[PDB]
Structure formats: C-alpha cells, structure tokens
PDB file of C-alpha atoms and ligand atoms in Angstrom:
ATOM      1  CA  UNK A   1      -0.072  11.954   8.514  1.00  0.00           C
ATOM      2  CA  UNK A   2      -3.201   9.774   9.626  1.00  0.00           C
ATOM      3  CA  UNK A   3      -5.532   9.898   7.261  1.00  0.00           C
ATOM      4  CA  UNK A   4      -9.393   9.886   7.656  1.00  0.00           C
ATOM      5  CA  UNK A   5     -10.726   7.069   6.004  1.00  0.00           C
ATOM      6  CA  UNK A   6     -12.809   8.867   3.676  1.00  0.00           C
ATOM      7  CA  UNK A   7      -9.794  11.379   3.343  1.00  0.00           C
ATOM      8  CA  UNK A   8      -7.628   8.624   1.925  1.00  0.00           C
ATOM      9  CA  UNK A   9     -10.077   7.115  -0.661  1.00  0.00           C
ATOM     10  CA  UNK A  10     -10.416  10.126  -2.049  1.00  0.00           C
ATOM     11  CA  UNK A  11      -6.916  10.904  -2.820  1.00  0.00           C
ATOM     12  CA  UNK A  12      -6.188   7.058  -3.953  1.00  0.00           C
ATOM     13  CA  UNK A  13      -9.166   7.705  -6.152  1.00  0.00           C
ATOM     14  CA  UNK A  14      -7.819  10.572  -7.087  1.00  0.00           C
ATOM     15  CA  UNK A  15      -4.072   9.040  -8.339  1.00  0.00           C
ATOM     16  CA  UNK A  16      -6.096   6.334 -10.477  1.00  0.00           C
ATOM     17  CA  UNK A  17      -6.142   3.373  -7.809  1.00  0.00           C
ATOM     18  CA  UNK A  18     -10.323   2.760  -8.215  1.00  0.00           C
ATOM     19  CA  UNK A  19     -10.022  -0.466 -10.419  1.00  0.00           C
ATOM     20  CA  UNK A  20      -6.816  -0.658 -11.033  1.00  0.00           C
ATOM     21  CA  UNK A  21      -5.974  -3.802 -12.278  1.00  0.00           C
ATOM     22  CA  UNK A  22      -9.286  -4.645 -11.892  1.00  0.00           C
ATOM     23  CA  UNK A  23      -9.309  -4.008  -7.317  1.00  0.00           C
ATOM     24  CA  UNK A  24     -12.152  -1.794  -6.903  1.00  0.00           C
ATOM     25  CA  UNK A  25     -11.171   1.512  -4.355  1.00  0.00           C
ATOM     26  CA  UNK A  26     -12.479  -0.402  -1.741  1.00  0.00           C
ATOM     27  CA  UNK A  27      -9.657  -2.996  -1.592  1.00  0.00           C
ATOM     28  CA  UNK A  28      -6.705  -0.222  -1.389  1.00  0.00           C
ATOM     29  CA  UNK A  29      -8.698   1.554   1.659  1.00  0.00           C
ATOM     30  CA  UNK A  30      -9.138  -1.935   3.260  1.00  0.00           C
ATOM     31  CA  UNK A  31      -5.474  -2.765   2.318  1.00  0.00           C
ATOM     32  CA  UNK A  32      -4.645   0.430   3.905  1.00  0.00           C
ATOM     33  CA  UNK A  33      -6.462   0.392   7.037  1.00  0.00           C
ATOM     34  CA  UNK A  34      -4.957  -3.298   8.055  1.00  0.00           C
ATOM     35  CA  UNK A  35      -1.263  -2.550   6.660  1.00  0.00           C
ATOM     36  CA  UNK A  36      -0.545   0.773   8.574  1.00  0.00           C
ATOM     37  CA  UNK A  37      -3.968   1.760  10.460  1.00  0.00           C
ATOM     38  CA  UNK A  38      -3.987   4.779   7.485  1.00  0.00           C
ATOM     39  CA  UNK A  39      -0.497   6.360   9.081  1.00  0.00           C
ATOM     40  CA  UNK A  40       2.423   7.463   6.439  1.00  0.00           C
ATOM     41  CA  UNK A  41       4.844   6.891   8.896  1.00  0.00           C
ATOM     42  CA  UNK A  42       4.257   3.432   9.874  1.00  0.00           C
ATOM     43  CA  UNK A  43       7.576   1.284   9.848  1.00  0.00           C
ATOM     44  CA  UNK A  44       7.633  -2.197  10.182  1.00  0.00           C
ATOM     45  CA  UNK A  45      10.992  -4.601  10.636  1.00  0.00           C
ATOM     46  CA  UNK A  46      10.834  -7.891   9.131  1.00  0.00           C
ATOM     47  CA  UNK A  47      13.436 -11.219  10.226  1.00  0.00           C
ATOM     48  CA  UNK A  48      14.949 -11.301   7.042  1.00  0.00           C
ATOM     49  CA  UNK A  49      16.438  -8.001   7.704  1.00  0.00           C
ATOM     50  CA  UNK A  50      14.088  -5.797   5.434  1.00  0.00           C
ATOM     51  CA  UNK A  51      11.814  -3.334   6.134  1.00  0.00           C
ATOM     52  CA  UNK A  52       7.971  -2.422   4.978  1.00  0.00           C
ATOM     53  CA  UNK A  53       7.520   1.506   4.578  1.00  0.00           C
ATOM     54  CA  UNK A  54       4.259   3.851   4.639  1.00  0.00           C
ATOM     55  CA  UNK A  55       0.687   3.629   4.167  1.00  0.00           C
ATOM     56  CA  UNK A  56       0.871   0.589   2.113  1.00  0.00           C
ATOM     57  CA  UNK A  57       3.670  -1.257   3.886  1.00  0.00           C
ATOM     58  CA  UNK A  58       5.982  -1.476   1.090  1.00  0.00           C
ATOM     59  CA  UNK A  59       9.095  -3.652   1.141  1.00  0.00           C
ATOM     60  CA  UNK A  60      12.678  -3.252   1.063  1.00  0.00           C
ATOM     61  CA  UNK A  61      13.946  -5.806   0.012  1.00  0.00           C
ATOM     62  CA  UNK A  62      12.685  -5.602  -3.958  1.00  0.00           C
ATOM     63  CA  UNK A  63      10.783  -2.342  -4.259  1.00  0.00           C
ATOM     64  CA  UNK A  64      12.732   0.450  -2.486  1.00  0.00           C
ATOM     65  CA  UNK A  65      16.652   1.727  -1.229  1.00  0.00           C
ATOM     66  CA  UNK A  66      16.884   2.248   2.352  1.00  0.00           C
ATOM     67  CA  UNK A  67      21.026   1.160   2.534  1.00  0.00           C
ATOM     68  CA  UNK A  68      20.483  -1.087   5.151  1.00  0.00           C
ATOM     69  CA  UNK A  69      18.694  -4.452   3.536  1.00  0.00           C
ATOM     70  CA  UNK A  70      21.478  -6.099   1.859  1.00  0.00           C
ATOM     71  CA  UNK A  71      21.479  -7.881  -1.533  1.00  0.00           C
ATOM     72  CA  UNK A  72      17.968  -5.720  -2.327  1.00  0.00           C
ATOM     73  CA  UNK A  73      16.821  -4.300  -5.657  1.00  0.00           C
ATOM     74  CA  UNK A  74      14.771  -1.210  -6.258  1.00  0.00           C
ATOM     75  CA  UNK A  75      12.215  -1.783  -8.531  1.00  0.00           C
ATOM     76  CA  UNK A  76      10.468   1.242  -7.863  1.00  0.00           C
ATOM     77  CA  UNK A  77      13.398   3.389  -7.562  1.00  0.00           C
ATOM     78  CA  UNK A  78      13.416   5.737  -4.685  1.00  0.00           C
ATOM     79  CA  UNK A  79      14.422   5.862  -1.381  1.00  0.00           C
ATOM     80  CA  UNK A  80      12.339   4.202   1.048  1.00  0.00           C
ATOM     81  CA  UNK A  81      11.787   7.152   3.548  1.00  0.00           C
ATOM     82  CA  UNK A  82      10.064   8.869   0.037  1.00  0.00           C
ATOM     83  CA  UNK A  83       7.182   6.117   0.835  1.00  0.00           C
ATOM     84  CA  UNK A  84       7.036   7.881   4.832  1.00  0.00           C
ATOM     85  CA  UNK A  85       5.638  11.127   2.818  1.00  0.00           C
ATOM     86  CA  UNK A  86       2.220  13.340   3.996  1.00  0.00           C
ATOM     87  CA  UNK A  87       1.743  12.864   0.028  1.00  0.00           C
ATOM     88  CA  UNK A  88       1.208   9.553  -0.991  1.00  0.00           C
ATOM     89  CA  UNK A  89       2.036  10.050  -4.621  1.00  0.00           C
ATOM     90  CA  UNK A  90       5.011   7.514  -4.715  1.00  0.00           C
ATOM     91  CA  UNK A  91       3.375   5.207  -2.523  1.00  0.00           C
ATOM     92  CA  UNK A  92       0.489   4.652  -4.886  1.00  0.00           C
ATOM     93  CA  UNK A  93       3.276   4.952  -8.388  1.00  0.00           C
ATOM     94  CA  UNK A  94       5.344   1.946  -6.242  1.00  0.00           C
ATOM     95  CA  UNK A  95       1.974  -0.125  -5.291  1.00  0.00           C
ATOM     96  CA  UNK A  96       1.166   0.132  -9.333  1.00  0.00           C
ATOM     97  CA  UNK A  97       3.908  -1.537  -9.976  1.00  0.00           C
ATOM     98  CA  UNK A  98       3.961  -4.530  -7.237  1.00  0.00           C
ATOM     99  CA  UNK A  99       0.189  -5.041  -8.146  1.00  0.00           C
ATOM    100  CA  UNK A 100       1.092  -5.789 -11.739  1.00  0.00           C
ATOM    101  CA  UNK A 101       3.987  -7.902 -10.897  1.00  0.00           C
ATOM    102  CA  UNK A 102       1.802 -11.040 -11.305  1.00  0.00           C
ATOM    103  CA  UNK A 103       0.724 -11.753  -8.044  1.00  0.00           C
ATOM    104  CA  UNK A 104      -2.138  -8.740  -7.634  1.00  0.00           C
ATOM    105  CA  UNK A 105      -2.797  -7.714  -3.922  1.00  0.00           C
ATOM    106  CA  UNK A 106      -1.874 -11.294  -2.458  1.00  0.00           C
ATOM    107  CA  UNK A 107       1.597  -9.309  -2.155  1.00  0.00           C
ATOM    108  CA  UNK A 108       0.228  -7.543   0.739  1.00  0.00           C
ATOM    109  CA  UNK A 109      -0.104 -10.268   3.526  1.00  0.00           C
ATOM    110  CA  UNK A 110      -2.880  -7.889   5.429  1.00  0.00           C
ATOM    111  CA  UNK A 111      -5.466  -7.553   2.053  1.00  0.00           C
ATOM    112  CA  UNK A 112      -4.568 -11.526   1.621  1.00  0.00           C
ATOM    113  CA  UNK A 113      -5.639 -12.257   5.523  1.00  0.00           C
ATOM    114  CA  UNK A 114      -8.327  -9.537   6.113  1.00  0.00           C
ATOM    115  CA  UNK A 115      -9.991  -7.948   2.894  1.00  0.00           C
ATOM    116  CA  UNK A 116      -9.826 -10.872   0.683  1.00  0.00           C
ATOM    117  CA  UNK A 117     -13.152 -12.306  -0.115  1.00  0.00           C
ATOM    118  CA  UNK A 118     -15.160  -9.583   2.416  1.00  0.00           C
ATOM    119  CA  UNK A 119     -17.420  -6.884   1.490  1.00  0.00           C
ATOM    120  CA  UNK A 120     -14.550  -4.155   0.577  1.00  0.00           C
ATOM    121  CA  UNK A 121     -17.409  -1.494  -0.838  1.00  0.00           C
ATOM    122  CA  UNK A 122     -17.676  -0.872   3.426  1.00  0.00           C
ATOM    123  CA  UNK A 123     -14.449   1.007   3.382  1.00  0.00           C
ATOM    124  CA  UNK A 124     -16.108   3.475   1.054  1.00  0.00           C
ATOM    125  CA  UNK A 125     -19.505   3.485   2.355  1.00  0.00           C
ATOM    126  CA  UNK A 126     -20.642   6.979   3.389  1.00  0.00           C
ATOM    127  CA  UNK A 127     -17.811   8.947   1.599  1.00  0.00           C
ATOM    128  CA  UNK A 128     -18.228  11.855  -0.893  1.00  0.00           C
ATOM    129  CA  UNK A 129     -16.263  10.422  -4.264  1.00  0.00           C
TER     130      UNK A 129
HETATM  131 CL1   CL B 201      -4.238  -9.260 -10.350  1.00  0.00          CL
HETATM  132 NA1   NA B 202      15.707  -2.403  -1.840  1.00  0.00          NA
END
C-alpha cells in the first residue's frame, strides 16, 4: 500500500506513535516519507548483507528474521516480510522498540539526514487528527 500522507498520520496516531518517546507525529510522517516514500513494500539491500523492510525501513540484521542475513538477532520477533504488511501494526510495535533502544530516531539514517532539526509539524499540516 502507498499511503496518503494524511492517511498515514492518522493511523500512526492512531497505534500511539504522537509523542512517543517524546517525537511529536510529525517526525514518524517525516521519517516515513524519506525512508520508503509512504510504500509498505519498499525493500532496501544494504552491503553488509542485511536488509531494511516496510514503511519505516526496518533492519535485518537486529530487529527482524528474514533467513538470509547471517549472524542476526530478532529483537522484535517476527518475520521480516510481516513489516511488508497493508497494516502497519507490527511496523509501528517494532519501531517502539528500536526508538527506546537508546539511540531515539538517529537509528533511522533518513529522520537523522532530513527531518532532524526542520519544521516536522509540516507533515501534519492540513490533516483531520
Ligand atoms: Cl530518544
Ligand atoms: Na534478524
């Protein structure tokens, strides 16, 4: 699924992600939009060997099992292709859990580069929430 961009703020909203940990809704849309453009399927390869899954580009070589990244964990404890899902339920359970992790959202190398530090409330300006 592509989702709208209000569309998607609405359901992260939704599945408790609005100040979570203390990142305003606004970072997880912007996060969103520069990770996979909004698409559930996006699939990413990485050098190392692992790959980054879904809507929030998530990464297997600690958070998910996709049998081919060798000498992984999975610290969120489902299958990768889960994260490829119309419903981004596990997505957002998985993201919960990197974003504690101690680090925040400087684990995502796209919110680090391109939401950090700008106006985030414009990826939720003009939506019904
Ligand atoms: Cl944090
Ligand atoms: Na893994």
């Amino acid at each position: 699924k592509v989702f709208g961009r209000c569309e998607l703020a609405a359901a992260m909203k939704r599945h408790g992600l609005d100040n979570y940990r203390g990142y305003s809704l606004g970072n997880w849309v912007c996060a969103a939009k520069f990770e996979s453009n909004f698409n559930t399927q996006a699939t990413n390869r990485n050098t190392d060997g692992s790959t980054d899954y879904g809507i929030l580009q998530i990464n297997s070589r600690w958070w998910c099992n996709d049998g081919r990244t060798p000498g992984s964990r999975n610290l969120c404890n489902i299958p990768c292709s889960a994260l490829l899902s119309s419903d981004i339920t596990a997505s957002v359970n998985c993201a919960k859990k990197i974003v504690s992790d101690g680090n925040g959202m400087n684990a995502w190398v796209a919110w680090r580069n391109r939401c950090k530090g700008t106006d985030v409330q414009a990826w939720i300006r003009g939506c019904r929430l």
